[PDB]
Amino acid sequence: EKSLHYLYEENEKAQIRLLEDEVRRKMSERNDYQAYYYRPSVAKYHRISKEAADELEALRGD
Amino acid sequence: FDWDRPSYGYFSRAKVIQSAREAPKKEEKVSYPDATPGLPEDYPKPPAKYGSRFHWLE
| A33, A57, A59, A60, best to mutate vs chain B, most B CBs in 10 Å | A33
Question: Would you give the DSSP letter of residue B47?
Answer: P
Our measurement of the distance from residue A31's CA atom to the centroid of its chain's CA atoms, rounded to an integer in Å, reads 8
SS3 sequence of chain A: CHHHHHHHHHHHHHHHHHHHHHHHHHHHHHCCCCCCCCCCCCCHHHHHHHHHHHHHHHHCCC
Asked if B53 and A50 touch (Cβ cutoff 8 Å), the reply is no
**Residue B36 and residue A33: Cα distance in Å, rounded?**
6
Those residues of chain A whose CB sits closer than 8 Å to some CB in chain B are 9, 12-13, 16-17, 20, 31-35, 38
**Residue B24 and residue A16: Cα distance in Å, rounded?**
56
**Residue B19 and residue B38: Cα distance in Å, rounded?**
47
Asked if A52 and A43 touch (Cβ cutoff 8 Å), the reply is no
Q: Is B50 exposed, middle or buried (0-12, 13-18, 19+ CB in 10 A)?
A: middle
Experimental method: cryo-EM
Question: Is the Cα torsion angle A15, A20, A25, A27 positive or negative in sign?
Answer: positive
Cβ neighbours of A7 (radius 10 Å): 10
A-chain residues near B32 (CB < 8 A): none
Note the resolution in Å, 1 decimal.
3.3
